[PDB]
Design an enzyme around this catalytic site. Structure first.
Site, PDB file in Angstrom:
ATOM      1  N   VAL A  27       0.822  -1.212   0.000  1.00 30.65           N
ATOM      2  CA  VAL A  27       0.000   0.000   0.000  1.00 30.65           C
ATOM      3  C   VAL A  27       0.857   1.264   0.000  1.00 30.65           C
ATOM      4  O   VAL A  27       2.022   1.243   0.416  1.00 30.65           O
ATOM      5  CB  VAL A  27      -1.012   0.046   1.188  1.00 30.65           C
ATOM      6  CG1 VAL A  27      -2.060  -1.060   1.059  1.00 30.65           C
ATOM      7  CG2 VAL A  27      -0.294  -0.023   2.538  1.00 30.65           C
ATOM      8  N   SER A  29       2.082   2.899  -2.470  1.00 27.32           N
ATOM      9  CA  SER A  29       3.057   2.937  -3.570  1.00 27.32           C
ATOM     10  C   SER A  29       4.360   3.644  -3.192  1.00 27.32           C
ATOM     11  O   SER A  29       4.738   4.645  -3.803  1.00 27.32           O
ATOM     12  CB  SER A  29       2.438   3.533  -4.842  1.00 27.32           C
ATOM     13  OG  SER A  29       1.889   4.814  -4.583  1.00 27.32           O
ATOM     14  N   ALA A  31       5.208   5.475  -0.656  1.00 27.34           N
ATOM     15  CA  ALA A  31       5.089   6.677   0.183  1.00 27.34           C
ATOM     16  C   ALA A  31       5.225   6.421   1.687  1.00 27.34           C
ATOM     17  O   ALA A  31       5.791   7.243   2.413  1.00 27.34           O
ATOM     18  CB  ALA A  31       3.784   7.403  -0.110  1.00 27.34           C
ATOM     19  N   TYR A  32       4.699   5.290   2.153  1.00 23.91           N
ATOM     20  CA  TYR A  32       4.740   4.960   3.579  1.00 23.91           C
ATOM     21  C   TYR A  32       5.972   4.132   3.949  1.00 23.91           C
ATOM     22  O   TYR A  32       6.182   3.803   5.117  1.00 23.91           O
ATOM     23  CB  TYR A  32       3.456   4.238   4.000  1.00 23.91           C
ATOM     24  CG  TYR A  32       2.188   4.987   3.665  1.00 23.91           C
ATOM     25  CD1 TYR A  32       2.008   6.314   4.065  1.00 23.91           C
ATOM     26  CD2 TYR A  32       1.156   4.367   2.960  1.00 23.91           C
ATOM     27  CE1 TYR A  32       0.838   7.007   3.761  1.00 23.91           C
ATOM     28  CE2 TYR A  32      -0.023   5.053   2.650  1.00 23.91           C
ATOM     29  CZ  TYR A  32      -0.172   6.373   3.055  1.00 23.91           C
ATOM     30  OH  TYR A  32      -1.329   7.062   2.755  1.00 23.91           O
ATOM     31  N   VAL A  35       5.501  -1.041   3.139  1.00 22.49           N
ATOM     32  CA  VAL A  35       4.314  -1.289   3.967  1.00 22.49           C
ATOM     33  C   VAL A  35       3.264  -2.111   3.220  1.00 22.49           C
ATOM     34  O   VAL A  35       2.939  -1.823   2.065  1.00 22.49           O
ATOM     35  CB  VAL A  35       3.690   0.043   4.489  1.00 22.49           C
ATOM     36  CG1 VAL A  35       2.363  -0.201   5.214  1.00 22.49           C
ATOM     37  CG2 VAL A  35       4.659   0.760   5.422  1.00 22.49           C
ATOM     38  N   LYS A  50       4.936  -3.035   8.298  1.00 22.67           N
ATOM     39  CA  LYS A  50       6.077  -2.316   7.760  1.00 22.67           C
ATOM     40  C   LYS A  50       7.349  -3.131   7.951  1.00 22.67           C
ATOM     41  O   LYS A  50       7.711  -3.482   9.076  1.00 22.67           O
ATOM     42  CB  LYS A  50       6.203  -0.960   8.455  1.00 22.67           C
ATOM     43  CG  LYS A  50       7.283  -0.050   7.908  1.00 22.67           C
ATOM     44  CD  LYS A  50       7.451   1.140   8.821  1.00 22.67           C
ATOM     45  CE  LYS A  50       8.178   2.263   8.126  1.00 22.67           C
ATOM     46  NZ  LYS A  50       8.295   3.441   9.033  1.00 22.67           N
ATOM     47  N   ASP A 165       4.629   8.722  12.225  1.00 19.11           N
ATOM     48  CA  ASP A 165       5.989   9.254  11.961  1.00 19.11           C
ATOM     49  C   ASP A 165       6.655  10.146  13.032  1.00 19.11           C
ATOM     50  O   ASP A 165       7.651  10.815  12.748  1.00 19.11           O
ATOM     51  CB  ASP A 165       6.028   9.975  10.600  1.00 19.11           C
ATOM     52  CG  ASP A 165       5.750   9.045   9.431  1.00 19.11           C
ATOM     53  OD1 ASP A 165       5.452   9.554   8.333  1.00 19.11           O
ATOM     54  OD2 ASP A 165       5.839   7.810   9.602  1.00 19.11           O
TER      55      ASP A 165
HETATM   56  C1  LIG Z   1      -6.297   2.170   2.957  1.00 19.66           C
HETATM   57  S1  LIG Z   1      -4.644   2.155   2.786  1.00 19.66           S
HETATM   58  O1  LIG Z   1      -4.296   2.509   1.437  1.00 19.66           O
HETATM   59  O2  LIG Z   1      -4.176   0.830   3.070  1.00 19.66           O
HETATM   60  C2  LIG Z   1      -3.953   3.225   3.754  1.00 19.66           C
HETATM   61  C3  LIG Z   1      -4.034   4.587   3.460  1.00 19.66           C
HETATM   62  C4  LIG Z   1      -3.428   5.518   4.302  1.00 19.66           C
HETATM   63  C5  LIG Z   1      -2.729   5.082   5.431  1.00 19.66           C
HETATM   64 CL1  LIG Z   1      -1.954   6.273   6.507  1.00 19.66          CL
HETATM   65  C6  LIG Z   1      -2.640   3.732   5.726  1.00 19.66           C
HETATM   66  C7  LIG Z   1      -1.930   3.208   6.926  1.00 19.66           C
HETATM   67  N1  LIG Z   1      -2.544   2.530   7.930  1.00 19.66           N
HETATM   68  N2  LIG Z   1      -1.614   2.144   8.916  1.00 19.66           N
HETATM   69  C8  LIG Z   1      -0.405   2.568   8.541  1.00 19.66           C
HETATM   70  N3  LIG Z   1       0.835   2.489   9.074  1.00 19.66           N
HETATM   71  C9  LIG Z   1       1.892   3.039   8.431  1.00 19.66           C
HETATM   72  O3  LIG Z   1       3.149   2.936   8.995  1.00 19.66           O
HETATM   73  C10 LIG Z   1       3.397   2.039  10.021  1.00 19.66           C
HETATM   74  C11 LIG Z   1       3.729   2.528  11.288  1.00 19.66           C
HETATM   75  C12 LIG Z   1       3.976   1.648  12.349  1.00 19.66           C
HETATM   76  C13 LIG Z   1       3.889   0.272  12.136  1.00 19.66           C
HETATM   77  F1  LIG Z   1       4.109  -0.589  13.145  1.00 19.66           F
HETATM   78  C14 LIG Z   1       3.554  -0.219  10.874  1.00 19.66           C
HETATM   79  C15 LIG Z   1       3.308   0.659   9.819  1.00 19.66           C
HETATM   80  F2  LIG Z   1       2.991   0.146   8.611  1.00 19.66           F
HETATM   81  N4  LIG Z   1       1.724   3.683   7.244  1.00 19.66           N
HETATM   82  C16 LIG Z   1       0.533   3.810   6.631  1.00 19.66           C
HETATM   83  C17 LIG Z   1      -0.580   3.263   7.252  1.00 19.66           C
HETATM   84  C18 LIG Z   1      -3.255   2.802   4.886  1.00 19.66           C
END
Ligand SMILES: CS(=O)(=O)c1ccc(Cl)c(-c2n[nH]c3nc(Oc4ccc(F)cc4F)ncc23)c1
Length: 346
Positions: A27, A29, A31-32, A35, A50, A165
């Site tokens: 998810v 693409s 940016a995160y 993940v 992540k 973050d």
């Molecule tokens: C519907 S979607 O496209 O899947 C989506 C959209 C926007 C977001 Cl902000 C998210 C999203 N949900 N939970 C998250 N956690 C992270 O970062 C982490 C932060 C700590 C962790 F232990 C593990 C992670 F993956 N980044 C992004 C997300 C998902």
């Protein structure tokens, strides 16, 4: 007891995760980070997993890995991203080389919600209240976010919010970029050793954008943005000037023609006068004089949400490791200890 792990190629790397996690799908693409969305069959939760990229490749990276794990392990608050799980397929310290972090899967980030649009005052009250509630918790542990912006504010369809973050290169802070638009001027131009109120500046920027649908300070560069800031809040007084410990920055500041603070009611036409008042108290140039998260929660603008008994503070957070110089393997061992000792939330 050690779960069974299964292997899968996803973000051009091999993810090895416990069987409980099913239907892994990348998810954001990129940016995160690296993940994946997944279904946690043990809890029934939709989760985000992540995987940390080369977490011990250098001293700096090893310490950064430890930092993120420490931070995430500490955060236990409704409005702050916490840790549902952390795991490694490794059976010992010697084979330890990957770290996987698990949190709630959120619906969107705030950027994709604001979408060039005015939000209703009620929506703004609720979203900002939650941000401030999360920050009171974060700040109470002597943690600073440093980089609050709509893209690291995650929201579900109920408008329930969590901060991501908490705790950037020169090139990505350059030009017409959202990466700089929410930064306090003292941090943007390295005026002085900064404190927690940098995050309050960011909230002010976000709050204004929710109210108008428009970036508050969309500077085309550092200098343009400063000019946009000073046009609104006025040029610094002698008092703040003294506090700018950077002689170079202070000298540049004084070369600018003096400007008075604008009238916020004329800037934010049609806005709730209580919202205007709070914005005025958040967007103070002198960080010493900005409203704190705890103070802002008690502002009349949040009357329908504020509950002094339902706005918890954090346990003490030991960050003495930050001033510590250690070797890669030492940071790695510290991280391993933190993984091994993780206890899931009820
Ligand atoms: C519907 S979607 O496209 O899947 C989506 C959209 C926007 C977001 Cl902000 C998210 C999203 N949900 N939970 C998250 N956690 C992270 O970062 C982490 C932060 C700590 C962790 F232990 C593990 C992670 F993956 N980044 C992004 C997300 C998902």
């Amino acid at each position: 007891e050690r779960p069974t792990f299964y292997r899968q190629e996803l973000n051009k790397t091999i993810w090895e995760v416990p069987e409980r996690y099913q239907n892994l799908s990348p998810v954001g693409s990129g940016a995160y980070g690296s993940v994946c969305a997944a279904f946690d069959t043990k809890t029934g939760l939709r989760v985000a997993v992540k995987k940390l990229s080369r977490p011990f490749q250098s001293i700096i990276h090893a310490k950064r890995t430890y930092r993120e794990l420490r931070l995430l392990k500490h955060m236990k608050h409704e409005n702050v991203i916490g840790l549902l799980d952390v795991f490694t397929p490794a059976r010992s310290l010697e084979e330890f080389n990957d770290v996987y972090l698990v949190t709630h899967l959120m619906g969107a980030d705030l950027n994709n919600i604001v979408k060039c649009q005015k939000l209703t005052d009620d929506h703004v009250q609720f979203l900002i209240y939650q941000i401030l509630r999360g920050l009171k918790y974060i700040h109470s542990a002597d943690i600073i976010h440093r980089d609050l912006k709509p893209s690291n504010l995650a929201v579900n369809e109920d408008c329930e919010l969590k901060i991501l973050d908490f705790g950037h290169t020169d090139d990505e802070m350059t030009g017409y970029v959202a990466t700089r638009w929410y930064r306090a001027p003292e941090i943007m131009l390295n005026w002085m050793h900064y404190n927690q109120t940098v995050d309050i500046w960011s909230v002010g920027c976000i709050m204004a954008e929710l109210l108008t649908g428009r970036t508050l300070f969309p500077g085309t560069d550092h200098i343009d943005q400063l000019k946009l800031i000073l046009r609104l809040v006025g040029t610094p007084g002698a008092e703040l000037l003294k506090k700018i410990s950077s002689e170079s920055a202070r000298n540049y500041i004084q070369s600018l023609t003096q400007m008075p603070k604008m009238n916020f009611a004329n800037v934010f036409i049609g806005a709730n006068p209580l919202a205007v008042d709070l914005l005025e108290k958040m967007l103070v140039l002198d960080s010493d004089k900005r409203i704190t998260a705890a103070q802002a929660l008690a502002h009349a603008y949040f009357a329908q949400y504020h509950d002094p008994d339902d706005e918890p503070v954090a346990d003490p957070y030991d960050q003495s490791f930050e001033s510590r110089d250690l070797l890669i393997d030492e940071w790695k061992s510290l991280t391993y200890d933190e993984v091994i000792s993780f206890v899931p939330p009820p």
